Design an enzyme around this catalytic site. Structure first.
Site, PDB file in Angstrom:
ATOM      1  N   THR C 152       0.856  -1.184   0.000  1.00 53.44           N
ATOM      2  CA  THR C 152       0.000   0.000   0.000  1.00 53.44           C
ATOM      3  C   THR C 152       0.889   1.231   0.000  1.00 53.44           C
ATOM      4  OG1 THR C 152      -1.677  -1.188   1.128  1.00 53.44           O
ATOM      5  CG2 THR C 152      -1.900   1.186   1.129  1.00 53.44           C
ATOM      6  N   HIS C 227      -8.040   4.481  -2.367  1.00 53.90           N
ATOM      7  CA  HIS C 227      -8.198   3.896  -1.020  1.00 53.90           C
ATOM      8  C   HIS C 227      -9.657   4.006  -0.551  1.00 53.90           C
ATOM      9  CE1 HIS C 227      -5.505   2.560   2.522  1.00 53.90           C
ATOM     10  NE2 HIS C 227      -6.708   2.588   3.081  1.00 53.90           N
ATOM     11  N   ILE C 261     -16.913  -0.766  -6.412  1.00 53.18           N
ATOM     12  CA  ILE C 261     -17.499  -1.890  -7.157  1.00 53.18           C
ATOM     13  C   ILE C 261     -18.660  -2.462  -6.347  1.00 53.18           C
ATOM     14  CG2 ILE C 261     -17.119  -4.202  -8.086  1.00 53.18           C
ATOM     15  CD1 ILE C 261     -15.595  -1.966  -9.685  1.00 53.18           C
TER      16      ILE C 261
HETATM   17  C1  9O9 Z   1     -12.677  -0.191   6.773  1.00 56.60           C
HETATM   18  C2  9O9 Z   1     -11.635  -0.214   5.775  1.00 56.60           C
HETATM   19  C3  9O9 Z   1     -10.310  -0.448   6.091  1.00 56.60           C
HETATM   20  C4  9O9 Z   1      -9.285  -0.502   5.143  1.00 56.60           C
HETATM   21  C5  9O9 Z   1      -7.967  -0.756   5.499  1.00 56.60           C
HETATM   22  C6  9O9 Z   1      -6.998  -0.841   4.522  1.00 56.60           C
HETATM   23  C7  9O9 Z   1      -5.702  -1.234   4.796  1.00 56.60           C
HETATM   24  O1  9O9 Z   1      -5.331  -1.515   5.957  1.00 56.60           O
HETATM   25  N1  9O9 Z   1      -4.776  -1.311   3.792  1.00 56.60           N
HETATM   26  C8  9O9 Z   1      -5.118  -1.042   2.456  1.00 56.60           C
HETATM   27  O2  9O9 Z   1      -4.272  -1.091   1.572  1.00 56.60           O
HETATM   28  N2  9O9 Z   1      -6.399  -0.668   2.235  1.00 56.60           N
HETATM   29  C9  9O9 Z   1      -7.352  -0.589   3.186  1.00 56.60           C
HETATM   30  N3  9O9 Z   1      -8.607  -0.267   2.863  1.00 56.60           N
HETATM   31  C10 9O9 Z   1      -8.963   0.059   1.410  1.00 56.60           C
HETATM   32  C11 9O9 Z   1      -9.420  -1.131   0.605  1.00 56.60           C
HETATM   33  O3  9O9 Z   1      -8.340  -2.041   0.396  1.00 56.60           O
HETATM   34  C12 9O9 Z   1     -10.016  -0.772  -0.765  1.00 56.60           C
HETATM   35  O4  9O9 Z   1      -9.028   0.131  -1.394  1.00 56.60           O
HETATM   36  C13 9O9 Z   1     -11.305  -0.002  -0.647  1.00 56.60           C
HETATM   37  O5  9O9 Z   1     -12.151  -0.566   0.383  1.00 56.60           O
HETATM   38  C14 9O9 Z   1     -11.964  -0.181  -2.040  1.00 56.60           C
HETATM   39  O6  9O9 Z   1     -13.199   0.427  -2.040  1.00 56.60           O
HETATM   40  P1  9O9 Z   1     -14.653  -0.281  -1.741  1.00 56.60           P
HETATM   41  O7  9O9 Z   1     -14.710  -1.555  -2.524  1.00 56.60           O
HETATM   42  O8  9O9 Z   1     -14.587  -0.380  -0.268  1.00 56.60           O
HETATM   43  O9  9O9 Z   1     -15.466   0.810  -2.263  1.00 56.60           O
HETATM   44  C15 9O9 Z   1      -9.613  -0.239   3.789  1.00 56.60           C
HETATM   45  C16 9O9 Z   1     -10.972  -0.016   3.476  1.00 56.60           C
HETATM   46  C17 9O9 Z   1     -11.992   0.011   4.444  1.00 56.60           C
HETATM   47  C18 9O9 Z   1     -13.338   0.283   4.048  1.00 56.60           C
HETATM   48  O1  PPY Z   2      -8.639   1.629   7.709  1.00 54.84           O
HETATM   49  C1  PPY Z   2      -8.217   1.964   8.847  1.00 54.84           C
HETATM   50  O2  PPY Z   2      -8.503   3.061   9.397  1.00 54.84           O
HETATM   51  C2  PPY Z   2      -7.341   1.041   9.575  1.00 54.84           C
HETATM   52  O3  PPY Z   2      -7.706   0.630  10.661  1.00 54.84           O
HETATM   53  C3  PPY Z   2      -6.006   0.602   9.007  1.00 54.84           C
HETATM   54  C4  PPY Z   2      -5.439   1.829   8.372  1.00 54.84           C
HETATM   55  C5  PPY Z   2      -4.837   2.772   9.186  1.00 54.84           C
HETATM   56  C6  PPY Z   2      -4.336   3.935   8.621  1.00 54.84           C
HETATM   57  C7  PPY Z   2      -4.469   4.136   7.259  1.00 54.84           C
HETATM   58  C8  PPY Z   2      -5.064   3.183   6.447  1.00 54.84           C
HETATM   59  C9  PPY Z   2      -5.563   2.011   7.006  1.00 54.84           C
HETATM   60 MG    MG Z   3     -14.235  -1.655  -5.057  1.00 51.94          MG
END
Ligand code: 9O9
Ligand code: PPY
Ligand code: MG
Ligand code: 9O9
Ligand code: 9O9
Ligand code: 9O9
Ligand code: PPY
Ligand code: PPY
Ligand code: PPY
Ligand code: MG
Ligand code: MG
Ligand code: MG
Lengths: 332, 332, 332, 332
Positions: C152, C227, C261
């Site tokens: 990430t 993100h 999505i």
């Molecule tokens: C509660 C929550 C925590 C994380 C923690 C992380 C993470 O620790 N590392 C990371 O690399 N991406 C994260 N994400 C982004 C995720 O991986 C996707 O980028 C998005 O959720 C795509 O969009 P949706 O499909 O949710 O619309 C999160 C998304 C949500 C909702």
């Molecule tokens: O999604 C979050 O808030 C998390 O708990 C993990 C994290 C923490 C900080 C940035 C992105 C994801």
């Molecule tokens: Mg998505």
């Protein structure tokens, strides 16, 4: 009243619902009625700064004579529907404001009475089934001192006014066509142009090639217009065709626009897009309904102040300067 | 009724909710169902003025025969869901109005009964698993006097109708497929084209290269269509592909469009974008639901008046003139 | 459940408000959270017709192995917030569906436990202040059988989660980072790439030149992503950069996308814009919250059906064919 | 307070309605007031990843001196309307935050008192009818240690403030113009430029050619601005002209922008479109109204955190890097 919208509220209060609907409505789904307003609201002006505003003037010359503002009262039929003094109240206020007044073929006071008010009367023509009768109406207007013939060219027949149909709206017995129809063609335009030395102004042009043909036909002007959204439902707003038409006309005739002008800023927008002048329809009737002649006077004083305000804020000492302003489309 | 929307309100009142939902719904999120209407509402026509309207006619020639309007009734399955007379009521009204009627493969009255009503029956084909059975259905239609084969090409299977799933909707025991499936391919089109001298019209084309391939394949026409938003959710509206498809086809076949036509102005828009004719689906069923055969007659008379009104207001004495109109996209 | 939106409603019912807000929220004004959905809703597909669909398959090969759908479960931290079985429930369902599962650095069950479920585990890395510790985490993931390192790159620090601030949200004492931070740079990417033979996938790329630099840096893939709207508020949606990034990458790495999505049609849109595969985040947690492992299974079966439906309706027997679809932007 | 919108809610609670309206309102229909916000909401940033953020700094140099953020407090007249300490409370907080404070010609505390607070005071000039008096005001500001003359060039007169007219709003007897008007021209600019060695900054430029002429005239900077929507109603937002103006200016002067900045992300957007710095108006008064000097301090600390957050999330260690970000317009 601090805006034209104040007057709309006042007229809705006083007028019977079916008369307000006759005034406010458009054809069909009212797509073109709404789009006239959408189009103006999308236009933003790029104002100029630091120019000399010692002698800001809103005056223009059009068809050989001075007007106090780049505006005339649009032809609106049967004004006695809105106030007992009808056309005479509006023409008196227009005269006093230095604004031309377009007398209707379907006026509820005779064209000679309205012309006798003075001012700068224009005459709006509908083509009659009968070239000879049409031309006699043109001759009456000319004999009475009207200065221009505004030939409405977008009414081969009336559009489908669904508010009127749903309301079962009909003229009260006390309102009549005091001057007393077939589709007009370019031959009709030529017959009018040959019958009068007055400038012939074709009202309801939207296609660029019709604007060019109007110049070729000897028109002194055109009004780029979808008839306030009352004729073809889905016709483009005049404001959206104005710039392309002004470029195609190359100064060969005056290019007016109407539809949805609700402020002096809207006048500025139309000017910046290249209009010589605008027509204003419904707001004038709102003022007539709300307070008669004095209402129309107040409306025209408010519009004059708004036009002067917008011009000066935009760095324009004259309407010609305003026509040289640039614009940018936004989202609303 | 003064608009097609009046009929929608009347049909919602009378039909059971789950049958109204079967009729009104689309697939998935209904994005394509909504976009069919959004797309037409964004189109504005640039009308022409001062043309001869002595003999305005809405007639067209298509597949060798005259039609009274540039419109046919779209194939809509199981019309007995909406009224006890079902397809016969609709086909009678279409015949009387001079409008072609598309008989469905999944009609609730047999195709021979509906063709016996007379008029100009077309036949809509779904490909059967079995080339021989598919071609026998084509032969039945031809033997019964249908004039064109409308081969639906956008249903390898039915889309996901979430209203129907949520309602648990199923055909009543009293509605059946009175004429009694596999994905169609270009080989299926060739088998149909070789089996009949009738024009084969491919319904559900949206990609420009599929329209070109349809001409190469010997189609007599195409219907540019996303199946009223009922098949792929997120498929582009036909109206948004129509102009590019008409340019690519170069006159090589008739190009029809459907999806969201709700007025004669919408017919004018489709024509101005280049369509030979439109299909109309849901509004015809609204009229059937509301008042049977007489309802459909009233709908078609209203549409004829709206088409004539819009054409003349736009300066068009013929449908060919309307196809030469220009358009401008707006915001709504 | 007939749509992913059904699951969102079910999860809102069951989860505590502040946990639903942690899951649903974005940073700042949530402009990028909303825009992820706006962007997908503006895309319309131009489907193809009449192609052979005898053997429609949603399978893809990515990082050397087959996946049943062009989709993986996005990294979402602390899944025990949503259900007591947390990551194990989700990874079991993903395994059974043939979908890769991204294990988080901040997983609430250790990465070795989750990898022991089997399937195709990927591992999402956050850079630790300490190159040596970061690389040990990469080595743990590799030793445990993870198949890819999803680095990430859009979290130099956490964005401003105003819902969390307003709720005073904190992890319950019963949820911990079971695997137990500094901004990553291109030097960090090189240290990871040199430490492992697994493909390194950079997640959070939005600029075209960063996608090109990722290929130059030896990445095996990128995830075009903002993100889920949780990092920079006002970052462009990945879906809006995807086509330009796929063209710039010229096949040099896999190009995934995420954000918003919510259906198989959305998967089709992403594919048509050029994505190799998508990640899905919030909907998987909705299913976990609503019904645990079985909920996630149902979600993935529903998504598989929607993807197969959309592909076939669009004339695509394979995901590669879907990538060759054209699209058109609309208004919504 | 976790956003500037929190402060707007707090100020609406405490201020008298007509004073809130004086602060919040624009001219006319408030089209330009709304468009200032619409324009920023349509801009999306394309962030960069994986850059060194070891030493992120929000500092800039402008008119020879360091500022802690790329922001100054806009000139807002009569600050004692909002809090008894008025301008002194705001200037103290700005000083402590390292932000320049623009003293108004119509300040409710004398310019010498406000300059004595310290910090980086700028002085906003309105042209007086009388070159000699105008220049004496410039000389007072210079003698008192102001660092720049912000010459407001978009007020030949005040715009039409319809909220104020409807409220009958007037200054309380306890608020006065403690420093105690004609339209300015380019000659007025030259008279100021010749009278002072301080940089002259022209505030209210929107046309590209006026920005070029400002450089030619010897301005040290411009503020691309429609006066917060308070002058010409329908003037384009500064943010929509900024990129074209920055390209035309070619580094020849500082190019600031204002109108609608409501977050550090909005500051980032303005920077990415090429601004040297922004001005912030209404939010500073909200903070003053809600909690005096301490309120303004909290606002500026919040904005500093948001600017640092947005810059780092977008991969920018300096404001110069942020100016090299690309952007993409979206729909909202
Ligand atoms: C509660 C929550 C925590 C994380 C923690 C992380 C993470 O620790 N590392 C990371 O690399 N991406 C994260 N994400 C982004 C995720 O991986 C996707 O980028 C998005 O959720 C795509 O969009 P949706 O499909 O949710 O619309 C999160 C998304 C949500 C909702
Ligand atoms: O999604 C979050 O808030 C998390 O708990 C993990 C994290 C923490 C900080 C940035 C992105 C994801
Ligand atoms: Mg998505
Ligand atoms: C009630 C009503 C009657 C008429 C009758 C006529 C007419 O007998 N001849 C003509 O040539 N134009 C007419 N018009 C159009 C008018 O002249 C202007 O084209 C629009 O009113 C401009 O738009 P608004 O300023 O109203 O938006 C009318 C407009 C209204 C509202
Ligand atoms: C209830 C219902 C059933 C069918 C069944 C069929 C069908 O068995 N074969 C076919 O080939 N097309 C069908 N259609 C599509 C129709 O033919 C037109 O494509 C759309 O109705 C045009 O859009 P609207 O005019 O309805 O907006 C249907 C449309 C509706 C509403
Ligand atoms: C109540 C109020 C008074 C003034 C008085 C002045 C002024 O005597 N001279 C000047 O030159 N600009 C002014 N302004 C405009 C200001 O300087 C900024 O141009 C906008 O406030 C930027 O927009 P926001 O940040 O407010 O959206 C004002 C703005 C507000 C709201
Ligand atoms: O505006 C109207 O409806 C009128 O009363 C006059 C008229 C009649 C037919 C078309 C245009 C104007
Ligand atoms: O429109 C329907 O749902 C029908 O009843 C006929 C049908 C069935 C499957 C796909 C298209 C039309
Ligand atoms: O903002 C205002 O209204 C003021 O009080 C000062 C002012 C006056 C006229 C134009 C611009 C600013
Ligand atoms: Mg008007
Ligand atoms: Mg249709
Ligand atoms: Mg601002």
């Amino acid at each position: 009243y601090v805006s034209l919208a104040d007057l709309e509220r006042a007229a809705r209060d006083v007028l019977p619902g079916e008369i307000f609907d006759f005034l406010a409505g458009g054809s069909g789904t009212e797509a073109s009625l709404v789009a006239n307003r959408t189009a103006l609201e999308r236009v933003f002006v790029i104002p100029r700064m630091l120019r000399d505003l010692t002698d800001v003037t809103t005056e223009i010359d059009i068809f050989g004579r001075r007007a106090a503002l780049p505006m005339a009262v649009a032809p609106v039929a049967y004004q006695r529907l809105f106030h007992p003094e009808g056309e005479l109240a509006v023409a008196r206020a227009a005269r006093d404001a230095g604004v031309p007044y377009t007398i209707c073929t379907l006026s509820s006071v005779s064209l000679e009475e309205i012309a006798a008010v003075g001012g700068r009367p224009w005459f709006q023509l509908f083509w009659l089934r009968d070239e000879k009768r049409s031309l006699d109406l043109v001759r009456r207007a000319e004999d009475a001192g009207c200065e221009a013939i505004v030939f409405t060219v977008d009414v081969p027949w009336m559009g489908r006014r669904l508010r009127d149909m749903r309301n079962g709206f009909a003229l009260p017995e006390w309102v009549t066509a005091a001057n007393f129809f077939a589709p007009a063609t370019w031959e009709s335009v030529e017959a009018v142009r040959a019958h009068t030395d007055l400038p012939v102004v074709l009202k309801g042009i939207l296609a660029v090639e019709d604007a060019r043909r109007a110049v070729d036909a000897g028109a002194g002007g055109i009004v780029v217009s979808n008839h306030g959204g009352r004729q073809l439902d889905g016709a483009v707003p005049g404001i959206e065709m104005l710039g392309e038409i002004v470029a195609a006309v190359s100064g060969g005739c005056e290019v007016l626009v109407d539809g949805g002008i609700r402020s002096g800023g809207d006048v500025l927008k139309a000017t910046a897009l290249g209009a010589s002048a605008v027509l204003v329809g419904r707001p004038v009737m709102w003022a007539l309904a709300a307070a008669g002649q004095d209402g129309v006077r107040q409306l025209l004083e408010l519009l004059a102040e708004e036009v002067r305000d917008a011009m000066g804020l935009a760095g324009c000492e004259s309407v010609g300067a305003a026509r040289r302003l640039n614009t940018k489309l936004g989202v609303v």
